[PDB]
Amino acid sequence: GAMGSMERASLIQKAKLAEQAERYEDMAAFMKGAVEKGEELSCEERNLLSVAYKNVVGGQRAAWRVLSSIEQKSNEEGSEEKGPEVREYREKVETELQGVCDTVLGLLDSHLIKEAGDAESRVFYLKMKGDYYRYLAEVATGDDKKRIIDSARSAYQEAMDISKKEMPPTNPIRLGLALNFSVFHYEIANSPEEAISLAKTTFDEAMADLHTLSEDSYKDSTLIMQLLRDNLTLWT
Amino acid sequence: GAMGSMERASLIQKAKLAEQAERYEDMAAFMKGAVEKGEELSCEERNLLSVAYKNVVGGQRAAWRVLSSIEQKSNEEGSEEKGPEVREYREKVETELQGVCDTVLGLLDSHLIKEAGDAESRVFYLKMKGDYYRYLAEVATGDDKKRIIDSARSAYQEAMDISKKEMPPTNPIRLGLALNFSVFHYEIANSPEEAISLAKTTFDEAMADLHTLSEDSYKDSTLIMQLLRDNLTLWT
Amino acid sequence: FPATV
Amino acid sequence: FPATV
Ligand SMILES: C=CC(C)(C)OC[C@H]1O[C@H](O[C@@H]2C3=C([C@H](C)CN4CCCCC4)C[C@H](O)[C@]3(C)/C=C3/[C@@H](COC)CC[C@@]3(C)C[C@H]2O)[C@H](O)[C@@H](O)[C@@H]1O
Ligand SMILES: C=CC(C)(C)OC[C@H]1O[C@H](O[C@@H]2C3=C([C@H](C)CN4CCCCC4)C[C@H](O)[C@]3(C)/C=C3/[C@@H](COC)CC[C@@]3(C)C[C@H]2O)[C@H](O)[C@@H](O)[C@@H]1O
Ligand SMILES: [Mg+2]
Ligand SMILES: [Mg+2]
Ligand SMILES: [Mg+2]
Ligand SMILES: [Mg+2]
Ligand SMILES: [Mg+2]
Ligand SMILES: [Mg+2]
Numbered sequence: 126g127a128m129g130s131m132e133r134a135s136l137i138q139k140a141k142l143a144e145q146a147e148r149y150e151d152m153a154a155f156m157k158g159a160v161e162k163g164e165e166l167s168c169e170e171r172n173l174l175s176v177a178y179k180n181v182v183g184g185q186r187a188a189w190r191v192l193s194s195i196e197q198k199s200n201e202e203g204s205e206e207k208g209p210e211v212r213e214y215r216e217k218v219e220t221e222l223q224g225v226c227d228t229v230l231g232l233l234d235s236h237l238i239k240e241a242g243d244a245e246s247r248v249f250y251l252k253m254k255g256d257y258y259r260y261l262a263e264v265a266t267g268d269d270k271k272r273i274i275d276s277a278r279s280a281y282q283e284a285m286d287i288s289k290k291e292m293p294p295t296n297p298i299r300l301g302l303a304l305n306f307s308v309f310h311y312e313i314a315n316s317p318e319e320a321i322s323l324a325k326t327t328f329d330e331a332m333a334d335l336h337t338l339s340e341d342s343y344k345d346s347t348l349i350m351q352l353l354r355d356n357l358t359l360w361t
Numbered sequence: 362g363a364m365g366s367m368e369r370a371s372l373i374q375k376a377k378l379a380e381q382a383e384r385y386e387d388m389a390a391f392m393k394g395a396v397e398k399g400e401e402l403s404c405e406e407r408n409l410l411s412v413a414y415k416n417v418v419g420g421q422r423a424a425w426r427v428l429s430s431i432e433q434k435s436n437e438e439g440s441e442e443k444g445p446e447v448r449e450y451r452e453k454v455e456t457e458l459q460g461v462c463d464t465v466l467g468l469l470d471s472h473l474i475k476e477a478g479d480a481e482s483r484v485f486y487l488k489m490k491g492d493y494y495r496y497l498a499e500v501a502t503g504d505d506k507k508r509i510i511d512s513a514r515s516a517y518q519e520a521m522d523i524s525k526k527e528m529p530p531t532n533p534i535r536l537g538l539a540l541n542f543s544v545f546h547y548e549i550a551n552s553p554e555e556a557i558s559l560a561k562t563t564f565d566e567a568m569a570d571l572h573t574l575s576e577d578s579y580k581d582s583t584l585i586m587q588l589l590r591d592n593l594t595l596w597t
Numbered sequence: 598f599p600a601t602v
Numbered sequence: 603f604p605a606t607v
Contacts, residue, residue, distance in 0.1 A: 138443070139449075142428060142450050143450070145427055145428075145431070146427040146428055146454070151453075188383065191382040192382055195378065207374070210378070211378065213375075218384070256601070301602040305601045305602065308601050311599060312599065352601075537607040540605070541607065547604060548604065591605055596604075
């Protein structure tokens with residue numbers, strides 16, 4: 126790997142520089158190199174890993190959506206045939222996106238999840254696993270769509286089970302997991318009632334736990350609670 | 362070249378899709394492939410080429426500035442030594458930026474400029490040549506800084522001479538050339554009086570030509586006139 | 598689109 | 603920074 130000759134601490138330092146410069150591809154490459162040193166990640170390092178890949182795939186998803194929209198318009202009644210280029214370029218972006226998802230899932234499977242025993246690491250990585258299968262599901266249309274959806278659900282469910290046993294309701298990782306699993310239900314799994322139920326139960330239980338939330342996690346958790354409320358407002 | 366097997370028209374079509382998806386690296390690669398087909402570019406195609414590379418290098422410049430700022434702070438009195446990583450990563454971004462500039466300059470030199478005879482193409486490409494040497498100048502500190510600055514000036518000057526002879530004062534390419542050459546004077550060449558004089562003369566002459574400006578070019582030209590005024594307000 | 602984190 | 607186009 127191209128990062129094999131760089132010190133772990135230098136990779137972490139450069140991932141932080143890349144974040145400041147909004148160079149998310151570089152950030153992800155640095156964090157992949159750090160993971161490949163074979164040591165567990167600290168809490169701050171997990172956050173750098175997640176932010177890097179979330180931003181890379183986020184841009185790919187935005188571009189894929191633009192191109193898929195064009196492609197669907199091109200396949201409507203009365204649209205002029207303009208050849209294979211829209212499909213080809215959508216496929217190009219899609220394959221790149223799938224490659225990034227596969228890279229993240231490979232890091233999680235070797236060997237971040239196996240070695241994560243504390244709830245704050247295990248839930249975090251399982252959430253990421255669900256998220257990256259969800260992004261694969263967004264673009265999947267072949268015979269593997271159902272398996273991809275099942276893999277996302279299984280990861281989210283294991284994370285949910287651990288989070289309810291081991292974390293308080295206002296823990297930001299627990300809240301963010303529930304936010305995203307609720308979106309999975311609504312947008313991926315054709316289960317809007319489950320999505321709404323999860324968002325509402327999560328929000329209500331977090332409210333009753335606010336009297337215990339730390340001032341340090343308050344911004345993160347209240348933001349995620351607001352996102353739960355935003356989704357509920359969109360869905361009801 | 363990786364685009365050698367794709368039809369010219371397909372490259373142009375995909376550059377337009379990439380622009381819509383804000384995939385500027387892809388856009389630039391498609392337009393480089395189109396240029397390498399060996400035919401002159403139309404006016405719309407020139408614009409796609411310019412927008413693609415302007416956005417690629419624009420992001421690199423923004424990241425370089427963030428990292429150079431960190432680097433300079435790290436070299437101040439009382440700053441703790443944190444090793445080679447900031448310099449290394451700034452150098453990495455810088456080398457990538459230089460590579461993109463070199464690629465654009467190579468396309469212009471082979472063979473866009475040689476074959477451009479109409480003013481609207483020749484001035485456009487010479488402006489681009491000045492711009493990409495200017496971006497090289499922004500990061501240059503070695504013995505080549507002066508030569509790079511001279512190359513930018515020579516390109517901008519040839520473009521200026523053609524533009525004043527062959528285009529009306531409110532032509533957007535003429536206006537944009539003058540805007541950028543004025544910035545070159547102020548920020549690169551340590552010639553603020555020349556920068557101010559050029560911006561003022563350009564603005565005043567364009568005002569007196571507005572009664573001839575087409576409704577189609579009105580938005581572009583009035584925007585650039587506003588940018589000239591903005592710079593003059595910053596500089597005086 | 599709905600919000601995720 | 604000053605504006606360019
Ligand atoms: C920039 C520096 C680095 C080192 C990269 O840290 C980024 C952020 O990492 C922490 O935050 C975390 C995360 C986010 C919160 C919601 C952002 N937060 C919102 C309110 C204001 C302050 C910032 C989003 C990220 O995607 C980030 C890392 C991601 C997650 C999700 C990860 O699933 C795998 C689960 C929930 C959340 C939000 C945990 C949350 O704890 C700090 O606590 C923040 O201070 C800090 O900005
Ligand atoms: C998106 C579709 C594509 C095919 C890529 O076209 C982009 C734009 O190309 C034209 O515009 C041109 C350029 C810009 C003008 C200023 C933008 N304009 C501002 C007011 C509102 C409408 C948009 C910026 C570009 O960087 C663009 C292409 C660049 C330049 C400079 C290029 O030096 C080498 C010289 C001046 C200018 C501004 C010429 C200007 O003619 C159209 O006329 C616009 O409609 C259109 O959006
Ligand atoms: Mg070591
Ligand atoms: Mg595919
Ligand atoms: Mg339940
Ligand atoms: Mg052909
Ligand atoms: Mg250098
Ligand atoms: Mg003069």
